[PDB]
Write a protein that binds this ligand. Structure first.
Ligand SMILES: *[C@@](C)(CO)[C@](*)(O)[C@H](Cc1ccccc1)NC(=O)[C@H](Cc1ccc(OC)cc1)NC(=O)[C@H](C)NC(=O)CN1CCOCC1
Lengths: 231, 250, 195, 243, 212, 240, 235, 244
């Protein structure tokens, strides 16, 4: 109310309203889902268009050969944060000949987002990210929030109506976690997960976006006719 | 972080007033009375030593300060503001004059430099004006004895005699009746003590009054001998005993 | 670069400047004009380090032209020479100084007098009846000491100048491919085409 | 009024309301504690299991500074991480210049001054965390608790978060019942009990227990996480006491 | 290197050799020393290969930006001055370049500018640049007339490079010919000195110093 | 440094500081530009609440940017000096690097760019000035007249006016200027310019300035008597 | 007042949303993409009849293979075009090739959010970027001051956009010829424009692989206007 | 942050006026009146000191009239402290010009630069403008005798006779009434003093409440002399014209 003019101001109950308004931008964003087994990690994203004449806003970005994310909210802010991840993954390779641990990737994003919430002039990032990766400790899935809070999960979902997929994955937990050495089945589980967040619209060929990374699979994105298999 | 106040805190109001300068002058009005009187062979500056507590040692707090060997300053208003101004005034006398010309600045020019510093606090980003009015008394070879008043705006005016602060209005009237262009330094000191007694309420002695003069050179206060041209400081702070001597023949 | 001369007579300043541009064992050009018009009644010739010469001349030219447009007024030759000297006086204590020597020939319209200024790359300015830069002076100064008179006409000045060029063509080691001559007077700047 | 809209502004009381508002964010957070023992310190924190989908043991909240200091905090988690990152920089530069690892009181003032600095200007926000930290140095064991204002003291036992009053009451009993001292292995078990008791103030979601410890004899003066058999032993001890 | 370009009745001829050296080591015999900036502008390269190649390609990018911004092809004078002002900024740093900016525009007509790495910029009708410039000058000057035909001017340019290629140890390879007209530049082929010398010797009757 | 974003969007999509700068222009004295078949004429109003002026030394309303281009303006006088100075410096800089004087379009584009920069830079306010820039491109005889404004937009005009009561004189020019047949001579062009100012000015005494620019750096300012003859001639034809 | 980079309670940046209102006030610009080329057309909208309309430059070349149309505060576009041209030419210098139309658009869109307390406010202009490259063929992009760009088969921006976009929705198909697209832009521009459409107050342009980006003459557009009127009367 | 306390000194009103400039002019209208009058053989500067006290040292005082160089002087109306900042800049600028061109600075050039500095404070920087209006009186060999005025906006104009500070409206009407072009210095001296005497807010115009200066070619042959009048000289000139 009087305490939402900038990020540097606490409310009387100890809330940061600018950070909460940034969180709101994610809720308006199109749904995206993340889930993993012990061998693979999968992103599934519902893309959104302006109208029937327009393209479908790309939701998934590759960060390295072993890491990448999906976005929900302000896309330019995802571009800034993904670019930062690309550099941090790259620094780790050039300097240490070491693939950046997905956990460190989360810690780095947390600290970058935090600095924008404590200084005058700046603003919080207006996007939520789901980072998947395969590193020296197996498959991983992270959930980034622009408050700075990063969280490691077996599965999750962010965006509009993400609660449907998040409930489904919470039920399916014991099934999909043991889909080891089978990419197409882990994707099927993710495609079924995101289907719980659909209203009036269904998954078409230029609407669905799927990404996968795993033990013997580089981070690769599937669009267009390559996702027709899963509809 | 960093000073984000890069904009003026003193600005013109619709009526044309500079609010902060006016309010600074109001702070000066609240301040304790100080005065200055110019004689033919000297200048006297005087003020009341308002003690904050009887446990406080008022000797450790100097309201009258030496700026150069021939220039002295006194004030009315906010003490801390005055203290830093004296530090800056002493330094500028060296950096922008003595280190260039090998001699101390004349009174008018040192006054000019202090005025500049106070003017900048009126226009620069993220600062308030100084809450003091200064009275600067001094001597130099080509201008003789002089007495100046410097206000929070940065304006300065030369005076034959004047007073600033609490009871300045009454004190100025008193000085108008007594001042003539034939006053000797001792006559000016006498009038200064008379004028100050009107504004002072409690004790009136050498321990509650601070008083300095700009007069003859003091070879005994120089600290060394051998250079004929160097003859000693014209600024001298009257001792607590020296004041009481003059308070008997008052 | 190499040869630049200047002679101030009764009513004009005459500048002569060599036409050769040599680099190594090749004369690359024999029609080079080593001068810039700074203002309608002010001309500057220049000699020195390759690149520096033209870069400096044009930089001064731009500044004087800028002044002229700003004030709708022509700076006096004395004022222009002082500006040029100061630029060189700055330059000599830079990281890379301009190695350029100049002569400034001008007609002061307020005084109705011709004026010649000699300024070296250090920023050493002198007003002279006749001036030269480089090795040329070693021949021309003594020659002009003898033959020059302060009340000469422009025609007499040109004949006096022919005498200098002839002496240089006789005793100088290098072929400087003749000179371009220009006259600065009350009517401005004009070039002598047959010299 | 409007005295609470800007950081570093004194109210007519002489208070910085923005700092007091940051304290509210801390009170909202999960419970964390510290227990000073014979030859070291023990830290423990409550991790609310929001969902089944959270990977157990894989959202670590206790952080190490240098090799001998442990930090835990309640409130805005990112703010805590920023403070530890600074703590690590401060500890590194101390070791760089002076060779010896940073003493705990020295380290406490480094964080204290940094947090205090964020109450001096309106262009920054105060920290939304109370940090409990400590370790073992040349002078033995030290436990500290730092607050948004920059205020810190040494502690026998410390607690912050939503269950701070429950935890404080439990801590005060240990101090009274053990005047000679508590052993490191005992403190680990007690820490588990107190987190389980302090969980009553946050009992909608069930939680995951996390413990760490520095001890001159048990961990050789270095910070280590309590895992496996020692953790399950501490969990069982706590489970037995609530029933 | 030996590069030349001269102005005449029918426009501009530009001719260059194709050798690159590193001391006495012949590094290449097939180097391109003419860079085509646009359909109406050419740049010749002599001196440091990287210096020339890098900054003249860069010059081409600046000329493109000019015509995008000004909706008009850049003048030869302005194009040459971009390059000369650039190298003047690096004066003393050790760049090594002897270049010629040749081209046609409506306002200028056929124009040639000499630009080198110590900041010299000269407009002129004839220039020869490179270690073999003097050898090219000798033949070019002694056969040059303004009224040369396009056929004769092309040959003279070719023959002048051949002269230098032969005598100068650091020139050779092949001759690249260009002709610049009001309609733009026209490429007139790569001519290997290996065959061209003997062909010229036989047909022309020159090069009697050589064992036939 | 002072960083404040002074020019910002409002809810309706307006930049008020830019729009309030246009109000300053509307307060300024009227300026008019009319281009003929072989010339451009810049006319300027001078307010007559100032008697005891010294017209020798008082800044003229029309400024030479180079020998071939001129700039007149409406709005804040102090602001215009900054634009004129920058334009004059760019004029010399262009001659130095391109070896050719600026085109009137280029010089206008530069001045307009400067004005635009001051609408999305922190710590500055927009220029309270609109300009009329007139002249002839090097080696060209086609007249050029351009207009700029605080927002940074610029465009070419057959004839245009800016300043106070400019809407009245624009109305006059819109019916009195034929695109198919522009003022064929200098006299015709000056007269149409003076006529248009007389709709707004007051007395045709020391209130009107006229500057005529012709091809190849041929710029001259008319004196009082010369202008007064146009004023005298127009009034006698009017009484009909 | 309030921060320039402040979020609204709905999770949108105030300044970005306000700049979008400025763009709605701008003159109409329309782009249509075909397999034979991309057509760009704009409404000139002269504020007065004395203003020489050919000096109104709302269609602009970025490179030989990329063209651009604008709408809104058009003065704000100058530095965006300058950047785009430099980005295009610089990439050609670094890689000896034409830069992809999408990469160009992304580079321009990177400027967009570089405002705050960098420039003082967002751009008040939207751009239609049309071009061709070997990889993705003929493309049309809509670049906004939010930093977001969408690829479009057809798109209208400006005051008559929502009416024109609804018209483009019906008319566009994947087999349009270039000539069909030209007429379609003229048709839809004539509908949404205030004043009557002619060669002086509307401008056409196209980009083809063969001939690159070309702004049409007033004579060429006039004939397409005459061809359009005749075809609408013919049924 | 600090945005809360920013007055925004360099913005437009909805009417297109600069608030701070308008308020600075309002401030200046309460300062002591200063008058400049340009004659054919010299210039007169006359200014009224702000309500004087009898104990003020009058001879060693400078408040209104300042010397910029040997050929140019200024009369001040507004904040003195602000004026001295600008005067020192103007003094330095004159010496820079002399150092560069070896010629004394033309009056307008000096006036333009000082006015450009004022302009800057109204467009950028977020600082308050200088609350000062100058009357410049000077000579150069291009335009001869010149009078200019500049104000907080940074706008300057040339004059034959002009007043700044208090009661300018009444003062300007009186000057406009009695001024004529063939006027001499001694006539201008009388006009200046007569105008102040009628527009003054004081009871009677006396020597101790005035500063006076002339710039004549009344030296010896083709050179200009600045005369800043001493107290006794003002007393005499006031008697000579019959005001006291
Ligand atoms: C003839 C053959 C004489 O060299 C030409 O000038 C020729 C010009 C040329 C231009 C473009 C493309 C090919 C050829 N120049 C060279 O071939 C040149 C000679 C040269 C060597 C060193 C120089 O620095 C003083 C200047 C000129 N050869 C090279 O540049 C060779 C290929 N590379 C190097 O010598 C590498 N050096 C360059 C300078 O920095 C250190 C490494």
């Amino acid at each position: 109310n009087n305490y939402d003019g900038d990020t540097v101001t606490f409310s009387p109950t100890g809330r940061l309203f600018q950070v909460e308004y940034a969180l709101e931008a994610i809720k308006q964003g199109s749904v995206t889902v993340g889930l993993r087994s012990n061998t693979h990690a999968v992103l599934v994203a519902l893309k959104r268009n302006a109208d029937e004449l327009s393209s479908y806003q790309k939701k998934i970005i590759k960060c390295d050969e072993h890491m990448g994310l999906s976005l929900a909210g302000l896309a330019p802010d995802a571009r800034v944060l993904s670019n930062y991840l690309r550099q941090q993954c790259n620094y780790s390779s050039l300097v240490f000949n070491r693939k950046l641990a997905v956990e460190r990737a989360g810690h780095l994003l947390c600290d970058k987002a935090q600095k924008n919430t404590q200084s005058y002039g700046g603003r919080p990032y207006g996007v939520g990210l789901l980072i998947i990766g395969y590193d020296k400790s197996g498959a991983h899935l992270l959930e980034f929030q622009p408050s700075g809070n990063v969280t490691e999960l077996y599965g999750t979902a962010i965006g509009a109506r993400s609660q449907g997929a998040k409930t489904y994955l919470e039920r399916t937990l014991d099934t999909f976690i043991k889909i080891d050495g089978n990419p197409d089945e882990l994707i099927k589980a993710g495609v079924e997960a995101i289907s719980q967040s659909l209203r009036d619209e269904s998954l078409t060929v230029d609407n669905l976006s799927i990404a996968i990374v795993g033990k013997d699979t580089p981070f690769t994105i599937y669009d267009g006719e390559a996702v027709a298999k899963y509809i | 972080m960093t000073d984000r106040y890069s904009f003026s805190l003193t600005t013109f109001s619709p009526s044309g007033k500079l609010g902060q300068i006016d309010y600074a002058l109001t702070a000066v009005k609240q301040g304790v009375t100080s005065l200055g009187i110019k004689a033919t062979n000297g200048v006297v500056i005087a003020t009341e030593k308002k003690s904050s507590s009887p446990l406080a040692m008022s000797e450790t707090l100097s309201k009258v300060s030496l700026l150069t060997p021939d220039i002295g300053a006194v004030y009315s208003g906010m003490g801390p503001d005055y203290r830093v101004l004296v530090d800056k005034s002493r330094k500028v006398a060296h950096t922008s004059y003595k280190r260039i010309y090998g001699e101390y600045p004349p009174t008018k020019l040192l006054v000019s430099e202090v005025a500049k510093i106070m003017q900048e606090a009126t226009q620069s980003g993220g600062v308030r004006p100084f809450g003091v009015s200064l009275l600067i008394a001094g001597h130099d070879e080509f201008n003789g004895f002089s007495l100046y008043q410097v206000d929070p705006s940065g304006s300065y005016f030369p005076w034959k005699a004047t007073a600033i602060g609490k009871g300045s209005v009454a004190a100025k009237t008193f000085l108008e009746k007594r001042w003539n262009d034939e006053l000797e330094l001792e006559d000016a000191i006498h009038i200064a003590l008379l004028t100050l007694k009107e504004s002072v309420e409690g004790e009136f002695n050498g321990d509650t009054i601070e008083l300095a003069i700009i007069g003859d050179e003091n070879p005994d206060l120089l600290g060394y001998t051998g250079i004929p041209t160097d003859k000693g400081p014209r600024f001298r702070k009257l001792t607590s005993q020296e004041i009481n001597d003059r308070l008997e023949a008052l | 670069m190499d040869i630049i001369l200047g002679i101030r007579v009764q009513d004009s300043v005459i500048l002569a400047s060599s036409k050769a541009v040599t680099r190594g064992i090749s004369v690359l050009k024999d029609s080079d004009d080593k001068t810039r018009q700074l203002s309608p009644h002010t001309l500057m010739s220049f000699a020195g380090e390759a690149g520096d010469t033209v870069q400096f001349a044009e930089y001064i030219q731009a500044n004087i032209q800028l002044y002229s447009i700003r004030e709708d007024y022509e700076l006096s030759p004395q004022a222009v020479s002082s500006f040029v000297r100061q630029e060189l006086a700055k330059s000599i204590r830079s990281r890379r100084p301009y190695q350029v020597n100049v002569l400034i020939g001008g007609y002061d319209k307020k005084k109705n007098k011709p004026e010649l200024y000699q300024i070296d790359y250090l920023g050493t300015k002198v007003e002279l009846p006749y001036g030269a830069h480089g090795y040329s002076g070693f021949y021309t100064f003594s020659l002009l000491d003898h033959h020059y008179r302060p009340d000469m006409t422009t025609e007499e000045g040109l004949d006096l100048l022919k005498l200098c060029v002839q002496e240089l063509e006789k005793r100088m080691p290098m072929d400087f491919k003749g000179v371009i001559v220009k006259i600065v007077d009350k009517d401005g700047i004009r070039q002598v085409d047959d010299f | 009024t409007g005295y609470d809209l800007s950081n570093s502004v004194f109210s007519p009381d002489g208070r910085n309301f923005q700092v007091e508002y940051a304290v509210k964010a801390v009170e909202n957070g999960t419970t964390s504690i510290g227990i000073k023992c014979n030859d070291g310190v023990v830290f423990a924190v409550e991790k609310l299991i929001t969902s089944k989908l959270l990977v157990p043991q894989k959202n670590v909240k206790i952080q190490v500074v240098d090799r001998h200091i442990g930090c835990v905090y309640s409130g805005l988690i990112p703010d805590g991480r920023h403070l530890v990152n600074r703590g690590r920089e401060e500890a590194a530069s101390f070791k760089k210049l002076y060779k010896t690892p940073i003493p705990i009181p020295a380290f406490a003032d480094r964080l204290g001054q940094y947090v205090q600095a964020h109450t001096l200007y309106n262009s920054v926000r105060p920290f939304g965390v109370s940090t409990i930290f400590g370790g073992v140095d040349k002078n033995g064991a030290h436990l500290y608790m730092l607050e948004p204002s920059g205020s810190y003291w040494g502690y026998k036992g410390a607690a912050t978060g939503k269950g701070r009053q429950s935890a404080k009451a439990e801590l005060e009993k240990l101090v009274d019942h053990h005047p000679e001292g508590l052993s490191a292995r005992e403190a680990v078990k007690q820490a588990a009990k107190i987190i389980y008791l302090a969980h009553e103030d946050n009992k909608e979601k069930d939680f995951e227990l996390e413990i760490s410890w520095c001890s001159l004899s048990e961990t050789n003066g270095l910070h280590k996480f309590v895992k496996g058999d020692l953790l399950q032993e501490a969990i069982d001890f706590a489970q037995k006491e609530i029933n | 290197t030996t590069t030349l370009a001269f102005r005449f009745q029918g426009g501009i001829i530009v001719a260059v050799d194709s050798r690159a050296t590193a001391g006495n080591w012949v590094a290449s015999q097939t180097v391109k020393k003419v860079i085509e900036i646009n359909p109406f502008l050419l740049g010749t390269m002599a001196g440091g290969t990287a210096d020339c190649q890098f900054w003249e390609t860069w010059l081409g990018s600046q000329c493109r930006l000019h015509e995008l911004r000004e909706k008009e092809r850049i003048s030869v004078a302005a194009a040459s001055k971009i390059l000369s002002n650039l190298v003047y900024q690096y004066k003393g740093a050790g760049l090594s370049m002897g270049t010629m900016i040749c081209g046609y525009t409506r306002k200028e007509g056929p124009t040639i500018y000499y630009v080198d790495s110590d900041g010299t910029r000269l407009k002129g009708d004839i220039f020869c640049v490179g270690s073999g410039q003097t050898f090219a000058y000798g033949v070019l000057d002694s056969n040059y007339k303004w009224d040369l035909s396009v056929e004769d001017a092309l040959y003279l340019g070719k023959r002048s490079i051949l002269a230098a290629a032969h005598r100068d140890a650091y020139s050779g390879g092949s001759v690249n010919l260009y002709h610049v007209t009001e309609d733009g530049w026209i490429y007139h082929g790569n001519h290997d000195v290996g065959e061209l010398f003997w062909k010229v010797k036989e047909e022309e009757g020159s090069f009697n110093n050589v064992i036939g | 440094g002072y960083d404040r974003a002074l020019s910002i969007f409002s809810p309706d999509g307006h930049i008020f500081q830019v729009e309030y700068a246009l109000e300053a222009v509307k307060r300024g004295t009227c300026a008019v530009g009319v281009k003929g078949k072989n010339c451009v004429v810049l006319g300027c109003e001078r307010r007559s609440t100032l008697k005891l002026q010294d017209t020798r030394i008082t800044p003229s309303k029309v400024s030479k940017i180079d020998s071939h281009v001129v700039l007149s303006f409406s709005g804040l006088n102090a602001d215009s000096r900054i634009l004129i100075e920058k334009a004059r410096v760019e004029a010399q800089s262009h001659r130095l690097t391109l070896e050719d004087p600026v085109t009137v379009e280029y010089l206008t584009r530069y001045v307009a760019g400067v004005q635009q920069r001051y609408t999305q830079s922190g710590g500055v306010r927009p220029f309270g000035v609109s300009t009329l820039i007139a002249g002839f491109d090097p080696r060209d005889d086609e007249p050029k007249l351009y207009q700029t404004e605080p927002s940074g937009i610029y465009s070419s005009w057959s004839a245009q006016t800016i300043g106070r009561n400019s809407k009245t004189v624009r109305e006059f020019l819109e019916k009195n200027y034929d695109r198919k047949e522009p003022p064929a001579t200098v006299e015709e062009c000056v007269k149409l310019t003076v006529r248009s100012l007389l709709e707004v000015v007051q007395t045709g005494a020391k209130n009107i300035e006229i500057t005529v620019v012709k091809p190849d750096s041929d710029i001259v300012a008319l004196s009082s008597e010369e202008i007064n003859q146009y004023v005298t001639q127009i009034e006698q034809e009017k009484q009909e | 007042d309030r921060g320039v980079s402040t979020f609204s309670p709905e999770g949108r940046l105030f300044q970005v949303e306000y700049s979008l209102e400025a763009i709605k006030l701008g003159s109409t610009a329309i782009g249509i993409a075909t397999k034979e080329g991309v057509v760009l057309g704009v409404e000139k909208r002269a504020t007065s009849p004395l203003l020489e309309s050919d000096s109104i430059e709302k269609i602009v070349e970025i490179d030989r293979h990329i063209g651009c149309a604008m709408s809104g505060l058009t003065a704000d576009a100058r530095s965006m075009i300058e950047h785009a041209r430099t980005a295009a030419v610089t990439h050609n210098l670094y890689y000896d090739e034409d830069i992809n139309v999408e990469s160009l658009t992304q580079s321009v869109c990177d400027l967009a959010l570089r405002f705050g307390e960098l420039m003082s406010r967002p751009f008040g202009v939207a751009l239609l970027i049309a071009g061709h490259d070997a990889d993705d063929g003929y493309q049309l992009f809509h670049a906004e001051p939010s930093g977001t760009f969408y690829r479009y088969n057809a798109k209208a921006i400006g005051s008559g956009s929502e009416g024109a976009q609804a018209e483009l929705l019906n008319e566009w198909h994947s087999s349009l010829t270039l000539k069909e697209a030209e007429l379609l832009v003229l048709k839809i521009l004539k509908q949404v424009m205030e004043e009557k459409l002619d060669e002086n107050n509307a401008q056409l342009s196209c980009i083809t692989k063969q001939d690159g980006f070309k702004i049409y003459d007033n004579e060429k557009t006039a004939e397409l206007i005459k061809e359009l009127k005749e075809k609408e009367a013919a049924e | 942050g600090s945005r809360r306390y920013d007055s925004r000194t360099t913005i437009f009103s909805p009417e297109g006026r600069l608030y701070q400039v308008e308020y600075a002019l309002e401030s200046i209208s309460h300062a002591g009146t200063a008058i400049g009058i340009m004659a054919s053989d010299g210039i007169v500067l006359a200014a009224e000191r702000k309500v004087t006290s009898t104990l003020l040292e009058q001879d060693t005082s400078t408040e209104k009239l300042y010397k910029l160089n040997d050929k140019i002087a200024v009369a001040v109306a507004g904040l003195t402290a602000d004026a001295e900042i600008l005067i020192n800049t103007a003094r330095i600028h004159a010496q820079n010009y002399l150092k560069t061109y070896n010629e004394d600075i033309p009056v307008e050039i000096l006036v333009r630069r000082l006015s450009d500095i004022k302009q800057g404070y109204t467009q950028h920087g977020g600082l308050r403008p200088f609350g000062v209006s100058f009357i410049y009186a000077g000579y150069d060999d291009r335009y001869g005798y010149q009078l200019y005025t500049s104000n907080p906006s940074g706008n300057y104009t040339g004059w034959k006779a002009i007043s700044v500070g208090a009661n300018t409206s009444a003062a300007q009407t009186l000057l406009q009434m009695d001024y004529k072009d063939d006027m001499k210095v001694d006539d201008a001296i009388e006009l200046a003093l007569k105008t102040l005497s009628k527009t003054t807010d004081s009871s009677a115009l006396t020597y101790d409440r005035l500063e006076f200066a002339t710039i004549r070619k009344g030296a010896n042959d083709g050179e200009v002399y600045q005369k800043i009048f001493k107290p006794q000289e003002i007393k005499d000139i006031l008697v000579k014209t019959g005001i006291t």
